[PDB]
Design a binder for this molecule. Structure first.
Ligand SMILES: Nc1ncnc2c1ncn2[C@@H]1O[C@H](COP(=O)(O)CP(=O)(O)OP(=O)(O)O)[C@@H](O)[C@H]1O
Ligand SMILES: Nc1nc2c(c(=O)[nH]1)N=C(CO)CN2
Ligand SMILES: Nc1nc2c(c(=O)[nH]1)N=C(CO)CN2
Ligand SMILES: [Mg+2]
Ligand SMILES: [Mg+2]
Length: 397
């Protein structure tokens, strides 16, 4: 058996999902095993050039084991590139859903027309060389056995290693547009813009944008629509400026807001986080049409099962549905908590936990201040991370 390092890149669509589905595709093979995944890296797109093609790349690399021949492996990867949505050998390096390259086969040297290994550009690209050295820290290029590649990596110059990861548990950074987060001054509503930046640098894989206030004791449709829409437009104005383009969750309770925002921005939206049951039938219809993830909140087992039925009854895939215990919505928390793993199994849906700053789930007195809320969220976020909760929804990372 031969160990391969496969380079993965993408700069279009839901980037981290495209990487996850590629990895998942390789692991699905019975003649391949994943040994290790590398970190996530961010880099300016390397072109060779219409302005619109420069949208940052997400790169990593995975070390696999396999008894596949190098030419056989390439066939599989090309197949994997197509299932995901890679175009008909489109123009010379335009936006790509996925790109899977064989970087290295230990010490193999394969120089042919179809395949050359190591990849011919491996040592000129930090977005390829950096993830590889991460997985194989003692690796030398078989035709430059002298070259210290760590120094070579230095000549290639800064490449940003992201705190986003390929873990099983992903963080949902909260982005609140309501009054609660209002600080804006004479010539700048930058508050929400810097908040996103910080969610992103700090490692959030998903952002959850909600316009309606959190505090128990409304706002109108076009009003809530106007807040979400202005930010979503701002977000599109930055797509190419983000070191990392996060998956976006629209958190709304109104069918008419969903309808409106999805008609406009469905292309950049991943999931709908609906806090109330409301028009479930109609909501399922819309989300079925736009093929989005949707989240079922307990606003437990049977209540959620009931709702799941309608959704399936309306045309969405079970895999597109998460349930959420619904912490903060009515001790009793800590036992559902301690048993989320059990619930997930019965239900047959992935789990979403939003324990952020809810003093009960955490087990602190209601009195607790901001830092005390934060540190407790953070420490409990680690418990869930090791318990592989699928999404954890938090104010700070
Ligand atoms: N190590 C490697 N990994 C993947 N393809 C390789 C390869 N070495 C040579 N090739 C070849 O190059 C071909 C084109 O693949 P593409 O993905 O379209 C080019 P690209 O990846 O966009 O450019 P790049 O390789 O400079 O990054 C393959 O069909 C394949 O036969
Ligand atoms: N930053 C970055 N630039 C690229 C990449 C890539 O993966 N990352 N891949 C290319 C062709 O495959 C071309 N340019
Ligand atoms: N899924 C989910 N969504 C939310 C939650 C929550 O706990 N779970 N809490 C909110 C405000 O406290 C707002 N939205
Ligand atoms: Mg490539
Ligand atoms: Mg390629």
């Amino acid at each position: 058996m031969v160990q391969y390092i496969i380079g993965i890149g993408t700069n279009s669509g839901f980037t981290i999902e495209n990487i996850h589905l590629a990895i998942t595709a390789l692991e699905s093979q019975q003649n391949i095993r994943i040994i290790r995944k590398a970190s996530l890296y961010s880099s300016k797109a390397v072109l060779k050039a219409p302005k619109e093609w420069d949208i940052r790349f997400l790169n990593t690399a995975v070390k696999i084991s396999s008894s596949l021949k190098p030419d056989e492996l390439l066939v599989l990867l090309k197949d994997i590139e197509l299932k995901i949505g890679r175009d008909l050998n489109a123009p010379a390096w335009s936006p790509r859903v996925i790109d899977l390259d064989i970087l290295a086969a230990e010490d193999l040297i394969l120089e042919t027309d179809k395949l050359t290994i190591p990849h011919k550009e491996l040592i000129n690209r930090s977005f390829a060389l950096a993830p590889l050295l991460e997985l194989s820290k003692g690796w030398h290029h078989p035709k430059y056995v002298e070259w210290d590649l760590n120094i070579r990596l230095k000549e290639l110059g800064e490449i940003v290693k992201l705190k986003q990861t390929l873990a099983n548990t992903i963080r949902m950074g909260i982005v609140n547009l309501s009054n609660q987060s209002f600080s804006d001054g004479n010539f700048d509503d930058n508050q929400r813009k810097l908040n996103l930046d910080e969610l992103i640098q700090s490692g959030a894989e998903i952002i959850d944008i909600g316009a309606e206030s959190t505090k128990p004791d409304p706002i109108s449709i076009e009003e809530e629509f106007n807040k979400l829409n202005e930010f979503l437009e701002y977000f599109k104005s930055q797509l190419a400026n983000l070191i990392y383009k996060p998956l976006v969750s629209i958190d709304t309770r109104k069918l008419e807001v969903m309808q409106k925002i999805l008609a406009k921005h469905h292309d950049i939206i991943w999931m709908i986080n609906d806090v109330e049951c409301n028009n479930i039938e109609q909501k399922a219809q819309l989300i079925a049409k736009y093929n989005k993830k949707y989240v079922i909140i307990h606003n437990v087992c049977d209540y959620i099962e009931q709702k799941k039925q309608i959704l399936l009854k309306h045309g969405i895939a079970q895999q597109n549905i998460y349930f959420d215990i619904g912490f903060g919505f009515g001790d009793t928390a800590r036992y559902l908590l301690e048993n989320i793993i059990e619930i997930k199994r019965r239900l047959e849906l992935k789990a979403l936990v939003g324990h952020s700053r809810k003093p009960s789930v955490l087990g602190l007195t209601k009195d607790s201040n901001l830092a005390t809320l934060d540190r407790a969220t953070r420490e409990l976020s680690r418990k869930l991370e090791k318990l592989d909760i699928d999404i954890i929804r938090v104010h700070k990372i």
